[PDB]
Amino acid sequence: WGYDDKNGPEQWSKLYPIANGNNQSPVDIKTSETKHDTSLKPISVSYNPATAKEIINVGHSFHVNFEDNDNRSVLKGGPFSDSYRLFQFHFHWGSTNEHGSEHTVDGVKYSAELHVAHWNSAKYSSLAEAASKADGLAVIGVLMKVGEANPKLQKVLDALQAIKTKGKRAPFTNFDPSTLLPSSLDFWTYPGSLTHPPLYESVTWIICKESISVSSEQLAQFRSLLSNVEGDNAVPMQHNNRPTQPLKGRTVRASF
Numbered sequence: 001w002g003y004d005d006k007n008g009p010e011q012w013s014k015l016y017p018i019a020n021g022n023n024q025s026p027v028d029i030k031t032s033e034t035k036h037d038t039s040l041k042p043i044s045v046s047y048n049p050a051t052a053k054e055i056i057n058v059g060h061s062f063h064v065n066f067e068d069n070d071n072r073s074v075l076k077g078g079p080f081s082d083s084y085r086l087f088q089f090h091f092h093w094g095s096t097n098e099h100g101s102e103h104t105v106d107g108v109k110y111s112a113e114l115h116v117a118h119w120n121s122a123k124y125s126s127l128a129e130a131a132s133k134a135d136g137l138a139v140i141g142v143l144m145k146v147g148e149a150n151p152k153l154q155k156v157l158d159a160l161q162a163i164k165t166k167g168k169r170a171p172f173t174n175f176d177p178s179t180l181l182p183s184s185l186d187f188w189t190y191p192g193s194l195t196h197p198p199l200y201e202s203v204t205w206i207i208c209k210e211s212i213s214v215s216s217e218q219l220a221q222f223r224s225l226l227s228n229v230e231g232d233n234a235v236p237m238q239h240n241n242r243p244t245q246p247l248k249g250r251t252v253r254a255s256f
């Protein structure tokens with residue numbers, strides 16, 4: 001699978017029938033139809049910088065992984081009674097500054113999107129186990145808006161030089177992902193899935209109501225990464241965002 005016409009989101013249903021499922025992400029969040037939930041508690045994130053492990057070029061994108069051995073970096077509050085263990089964060093972007101996000105609000109596309117992923121360490125003992133469980137994954141979605149350069153992104157962007165080509169790996173240590181999150185943690189939440197194969201419908205989404213900035217040049221650095229392996233012809237990762245999906249009667253709750 002990929003993001004080209006030959007193997008893109010339109011072709012995913014071939015090898016991943018769940019793509020045409022009822023709990024698929026991303027989706028369009030219509031604020032007028034979001035339901036405020038009294039039971040929702042504030043989102044609480046406590047990450048340990050020492051947890052940061054490495055950064056990897058995976059052809060279609062890049063993953064910044066963390067040590068998920070213990071509960072040093074966890075996610076609490078929200079719709080969760082359980083505690084979720086951070087393991088990775090990554091980005092999604094488009095070929096132009098205008099429409100590169102995955103989630104949309106009131107039909108409004110953003111430039112990019114940050115995903116901070118966690119797995120249910122209260123019920124399960126591994127990401128592999130939790131990945132296919134409805135209550136296995138919790139992902140924070142932060143919408144990124146084109147504008148002034150984001151200084152918080154620089155340490156990540158500076159590391160992309162060591163993972164230029166597909167398969168390249170590099171140590172990525174001493175970093176707190178929460179520094180990338182917006183000032184406020186007000187959020188929408190809805191039962192969703194992974195935005196790319198395997199497309200497991202096992203994700204409880206936490207979409208921040210507040211967005212963060214990113215310069216056009218910083219977005220250019222994302223597309224600067226190569227989807228090809230070393231030595232081969234350079235093929236930049238121009239985009240890796242999935243179109244919004246049918247909400248299928250799902251309810252998007254609001255904490256505000």
Ligand SMILES: *CCOCCOc1cc(C(F)(F)F)cc(C(F)(F)F)c1
Binds near residue numbers: 056058062063128198
């Ligand atoms: C590319 C780095 O690999 C580390 C783990 O990869 C996974 C990431 C995700 C994520 F939620 F981030 F999209 C999901 C999965 C899984 F669902 F388990 F396949 C693996």
Ligand SMILES: [Zn+2]
Binds near residue numbers: 090092115195
């Ligand atoms: Zn994602």
